[PDB]
Design a protein around this ligand. Structure first.
Ligand SMILES: CNc1cnc2ccccc2n1
Ligand SMILES: [Cl-]
Ligand SMILES: [Cl-]
Ligand SMILES: [Cl-]
Length: 163
């Protein structure tokens, strides 16, 4: 475990992370995709061997010894708000299980279902709160990755609010 488990936020490419493993915002079919997923495919293409997994699940595939946790959030274009919220919570619970199983001291995570799976809504708070519910019982250092300058400020404020 980390000596003093923390949350941090960085505004940069998750493919340049400084953590012991990465969470991919994957599609259910293990396809290269777009957004975070395309960056992950360019950096760790070997990790997409048999990476297909259902919505609300996570599947880890090694790239060398570096673990890529493929986590499949719901596309809110297809799910109801209610069923989508359940699947988004479940995907992050499966990420916490994988992070624990791997024995890593740190993990790079993106906010699931906030990009092309958001159904055109702002889901920063919804996705971040489900990340916290899952990851609070783990002792890995968590580093959240984002692209937008206003999202960086809001995520940082939410981390700081809990202290
Ligand atoms: C287009 N490439 C990327 C790479 N890393 C990201 C991390 C968080 C959100 C979006 C991101 N996009
Ligand atoms: Cl960058
Ligand atoms: Cl997304
Ligand atoms: Cl963002």
């Amino acid at each position: 475990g980390a000596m003093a488990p923390s949350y941090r936020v960085k505004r940069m490419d998750i493919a340049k992370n400084d953590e012991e493993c990465v969470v991919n915002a994957a599609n259910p079919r293990g396809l290269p995709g777009d957004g975070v997923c395309k960056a992950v495919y360019k950096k760790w293409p070997e990790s997409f061997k048999n990476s297909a997994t259902p919505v609300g699940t996570a599947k880890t595939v090694m790239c060398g010894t570096y673990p890529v946790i493929h986590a499949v959030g719901p596309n809110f274009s297809n799910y109801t708000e209610s069923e989508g919220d359940r699947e988004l919570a479940a995907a992050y619970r499966e990420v916490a299980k994988e992070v624990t199983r791997l024995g890593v001291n740190s993990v790079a995570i993106p906010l699931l279902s906030t990009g092309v799976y958001s159904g055109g809504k702002d889901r920063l708070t919804q996705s971040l709160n489900h990340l916290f519910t899952a990851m609070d019982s783990t002792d890995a250092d968590v580093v959240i990755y984002c692209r937008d300058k206003e999202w960086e400020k809001k995520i940082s404020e939410a981390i700081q609010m809990r202290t």
